[PDB]
């Protein structure tokens, strides 16, 4: 029922190899729908989802200029950040940015986001009130002071509470056949002996959307969290996702183990056993 829109900015400096590269990707939930790359032959916002292609040329032209302007701003930020941390001009650095809004089933704003990271570490983030900032270090305190003086947060809030939610609701409507459809996981359990006294039970979950899912193994009704090998949820390449959990069991005790699957597409949690 809940939905989200996210934009992910990535700027990477490359001393001796040109000016910093700027790339942006836009997501509705777990579905990417737009992209932009400053290293492309002709930098422009490009559609990555069928339901966004219906937007006119004025849509793509306007956003392209926004990305180009943001790219230039990021380069200014990167230069400032080096000075904040007393870094030389020889090292490469990364500025990441992610912002967006979360809405409920009625389309009302639940939560807004606007945060930054420098070289993989959190730098500054707009608080949940969308009025104040949280700085990670004394360098980010400089940014905080500058943005507090310019009342930067007010502009962020106006977008997150207005433009962000309104366009998200529009996107959800235009692609409701996909964005508002939850695909349940296709599940099965495999069995492979590693010896004559032990065997591996692997519980599979395939072809599900969205990516959010819970896979657990239980022995005699007790969670086997520590003894469960759980791989990261992975994309299949067809919008859907994959995941599995495995447990090493003594030979002959396979029926004492049960796999539990929870997903939005499932009305009730599933319980699986081997064969």
């Amino acid at each position: 029922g809940s939905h989200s829109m996210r934009y992910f900015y990535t700027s990477v400096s490359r001393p001796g190899r040109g000016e910093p590269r700027f790339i942006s990707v836009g997501y509705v939930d777990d579905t990417q729908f737009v992209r932009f790359d400053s290293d492309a032959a002709s930098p422009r916002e490009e559609p990555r989802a069928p339901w966004i292609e219906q937007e006119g040329p004025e849509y793509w032209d306007r956003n392209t200029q926004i990305y180009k302007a943001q790219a230039q701003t990021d380069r200014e930020s990167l230069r400032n950040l080096r000075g904040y941390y007393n870094q030389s001009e020889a090292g490469s650095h990364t500025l990441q940015s992610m912002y967006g809004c979360d809405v409920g089933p009625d389309g009302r704003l639940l939560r807004g986001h606007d945060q930054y990271a420098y070289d993989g570490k959190d730098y500054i983030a707009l608080n949940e009130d969308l009025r104040s900032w949280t700085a990670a270090d004394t360098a980010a305190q400089i940014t905080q002071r500058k943005w507090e003086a310019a009342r930067e947060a007010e502009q962020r809030r106006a977008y997150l509470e207005g433009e962000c939610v309104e366009w998200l609701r529009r996107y959800l409507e235009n692609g409701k056949d996909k964005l508002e459809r939850a695909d349940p996981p296709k599940t099965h359990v495999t069995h492979h002996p590693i010896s004559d006294h032990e065997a591996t039970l692997r519980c599979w979950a395939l072809g599900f959307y969205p990516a959010e899912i819970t896979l657990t193994w239980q022995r005699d009704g007790e969670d086997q969290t520590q003894d469960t090998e759980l791989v990261e949820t992975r994309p299949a390449g067809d919008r859907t996702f994959q995941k599995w959990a495995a447990v090493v069991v003594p030979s002959g005790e396979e029926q004492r183990y049960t796999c539990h699957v929870q997903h939005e597409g499932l009305p009730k949690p599933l319980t699986l056993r081997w064969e």
């Binding site: 934009y7 942006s24 836009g26 849509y59 306007r62 956003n63 926004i66 990305y67 302007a69 943001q70 701003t73 990021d74 200014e76 930020s77 400032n80 950040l81 500025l95 912002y99 930054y116 730098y123 500054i124 940014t143 500058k146 943005w147 310019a150 930067e152 502009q155 962020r156 977008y159 433009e163 962000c164 366009w167």
Partner: peptide, 9 residues
């Protein structure tokens, strides 16, 4: 659509 006029860090 993305937000514009975002200030530099």
């Amino acid at each position: 659509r993305p937000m514009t006029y975002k200030g530099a860090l």
